[PDB]
Amino acid sequence: DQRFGDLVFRQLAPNVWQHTSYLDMPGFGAVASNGLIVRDGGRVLVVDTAWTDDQTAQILNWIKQEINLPVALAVVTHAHQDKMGGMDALHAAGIATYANALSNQLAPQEGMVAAQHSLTFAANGWVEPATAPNFGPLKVFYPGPGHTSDNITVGIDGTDIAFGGCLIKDSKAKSLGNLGDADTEHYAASARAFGAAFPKASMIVMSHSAPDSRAAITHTARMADKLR
Numbered sequence: 544d545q546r547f548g549d550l551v552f553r554q555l556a557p558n559v560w561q562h563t564s565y566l567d568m569p570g571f572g573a574v575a576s577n578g579l580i581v582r583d584g585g586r587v588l589v590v591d592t593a594w595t596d597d598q599t600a601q602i603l604n605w606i607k608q609e610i611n612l613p614v615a616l617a618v619v620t621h622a623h624q625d626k627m628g629g630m631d632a633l634h635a636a637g638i639a640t641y642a643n644a645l646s647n648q649l650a651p652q653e654g655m656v657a658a659q660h661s662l663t664f665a666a667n668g669w670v671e672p673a674t675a676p677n678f679g680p681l682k683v684f685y686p687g688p689g690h691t692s693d694n695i696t697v698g699i700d701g702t703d704i705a706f707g708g709c710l711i712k713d714s715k716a717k718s719l720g721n722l723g724d725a726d727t728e729h730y731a732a733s734a735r736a737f738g739a740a741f742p743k744a745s746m747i748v749m750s751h752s753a754p755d756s757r758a759a760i761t762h763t764a765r766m767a768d769k770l771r
């Protein structure tokens with residue numbers, strides 16, 4: 544891994560990196576959150592911010608130094624602080640941001656800054672192609688309510704990488720994390736829907752653990768089964 548300031552960057556694939564920021568919270572110590580950086584021709588795409596604006600500014604600083612390509616857009620995967628805490632750094636830099644319309648509607652209640660554009664989804668969970676233009680390899684899929692009602696997921700076309708955000712925990716997790724905003728009744732089906740939407744993704748990236756195999760999907764579903 545490459546440490547840059549207080550953030551960590553790990554190359555996952557020729558054009559894909561995972562960014563990691565930490566937030567020190569009393570009683571738990573530093574808590575990592577993961578997002579994605581994707582190079583696509585002559586532009587860069589970002590999945591999720593860091594915990595804060597200052598940390599999210601360091602993501603763009605690392606991009607300028609290590610990739611040196613303009614950041615075309617960013618997608619944030621729900622209105623929990625580890626995913627949208629740094630929206631201002633993106634907007635300050637002039638970067639177009641996209642989120643589930645539900646996430647932008649929930650944002651002020653969550654103390655988050657809403658994205659500048661809203662994504663809507665068909666009944667099968669796939670993004671309406673009109674609302675996700677020029678996304679390149681970013682394939683956005685809404686699995687259904689799980690970790691939150693608005694949580695979305697992103698597969699990376701041309702790779703074996705799919706990003707489950709906070710919906711998916713790794714195979715060695717012993718809880719489903721924060722269920723304060725969770726839909727305990729549809730969580731398991733939402734997790735399996737993510738698995739079905741990207742059936743051939745072998746590397747599963749998630750918010751709060753190192754990249755896992757597809758076991759993380761199945762494991763997460765079966766811990767969510769015990770909540771019904």
Ligand SMILES: C[C@@H]1[C@H]([C@H](C(=O)O)[C@@H](C)O)N=C(C(=O)O)[C@H]1S[C@@H]1CN[C@H](C(=O)N(C)C)C1
Pocket residue numbers: 573574575623624625626690709710719720721722750751752
């Ligand atoms: C604090 C997280 C964060 C919160 C959330 O997304 O609900 C919010 C603060 O942004 N996402 C969360 C999640 O469950 O996905 C919660 S708890 C998370 C899971 N256990 C992780 C942990 O204890 N680590 C040491 C990594 C923290």
Ligand SMILES: [Zn+2]
Pocket residue numbers: 621622623624690691709
């Ligand atoms: Zn969350």
Ligand SMILES: [Zn+2]
Pocket residue numbers: 576623625626709750751
């Ligand atoms: Zn989280």
